[PDB]
Amino acid sequence: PLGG
Amino acid sequence: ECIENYAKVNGIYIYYKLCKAPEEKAKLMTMHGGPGMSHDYLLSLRDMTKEGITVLFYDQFGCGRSEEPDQSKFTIDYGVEEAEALRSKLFGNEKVFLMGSSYGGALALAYAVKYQDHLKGLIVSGGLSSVPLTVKEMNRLIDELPAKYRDAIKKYGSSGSYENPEYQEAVNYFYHQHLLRSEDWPPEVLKSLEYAERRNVYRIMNGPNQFTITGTIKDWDITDKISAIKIPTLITVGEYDEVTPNVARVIHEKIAGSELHVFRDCSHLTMWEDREGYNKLLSDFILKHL
Ligand code: PRO
Description:
Order of helices and strands of chain B: EEEEHEHEHHHHHEHEHH
Helix content of chain B: 25-40%
Distance between the termini of chain A: 10 Å
Chain B: Proline iminopeptidase
Keywords: alpha-beta hydrolase, caged active site, substrate recognition, hydrogen bonded network, peptide cleavage, hydrolase
Strand content of chain B: 15-25%
Distance between the termini of chain B: 23 Å
Number of helices of chain A: 0
CATH topology of chain B: Rossmann fold
Largest sheet of chain A: none
Number of strands of chain B: 8
Shape of chain B: globular
Bound molecules: proline
Strand content of chain A: under 5%
Largest sheet of chain B: 8 strands, mixed
Structural class of chain B: alpha/beta
Oligomer: heterodimer
PDB class: hydrolase
Structural class of chain A: little secondary structure
Chain A: plgg
Largest interface: A-B, 4 and 15 residues
Assembly: dimeric
Number of strands of chain A: 0
């Protein structure tokens, strides 16, 4: 989905 | 430890990692979330093997290292049969404890509803019996977000600019607030997140991100069925969990004799924020129902  | 192999389940190759415990007293099967993530972010549970608890990890269909079946098979029910077929293929008739996280929790409940006879106990962490309720609750969390981020989610989200630099910034805040609240996100978590953004399961079944469930499981809700579960059950949820304790409550109210534990200062991935306390609580519950 994400985080960076 | 941890034997790593490729079990052929329901016609496709499913990756699994079984970490055996010395004087094994029980086998714990685990269900990662997403849908579309991977077992990786659940590796912290591996500590329970020092408690005489063998833990079974595995990538669900189309997730992580496992191959993807036909899209028509992207369902919770299909995952249920996969889990049962895998437990059987690896353990035969032996009863096991089943643990599920987030979506894995919802998958565990649906499993228990149909195959609770193969279980000794059920454990749900940040799980849910109703996606709609989960969406409703997460929206609230969005409204409690600072103006900018709240508007970014609404504006860019309604237009579909999930790639926007602002929207992303909002997603990050939310995450560090309801997904994982601690500093230094462990590699195991990052890999699961990376696995989601790469495969196709997350995008088809779940949706854009954690708080945006527009996928195929958007209407899923078995709150009415989970009341048939008559096995020892442990329900855990973080204080700031993206799947608020309110969602956990519903599950708790239906399962008679279930225990509900709300981890303070923790959120979704409580197995990393309070690794010791989490693993201790799970091993205590397991060994209590041997
Ligand atoms: O992780 C998400 O985006 C939601 C909550 C679990 C299932 N889909």
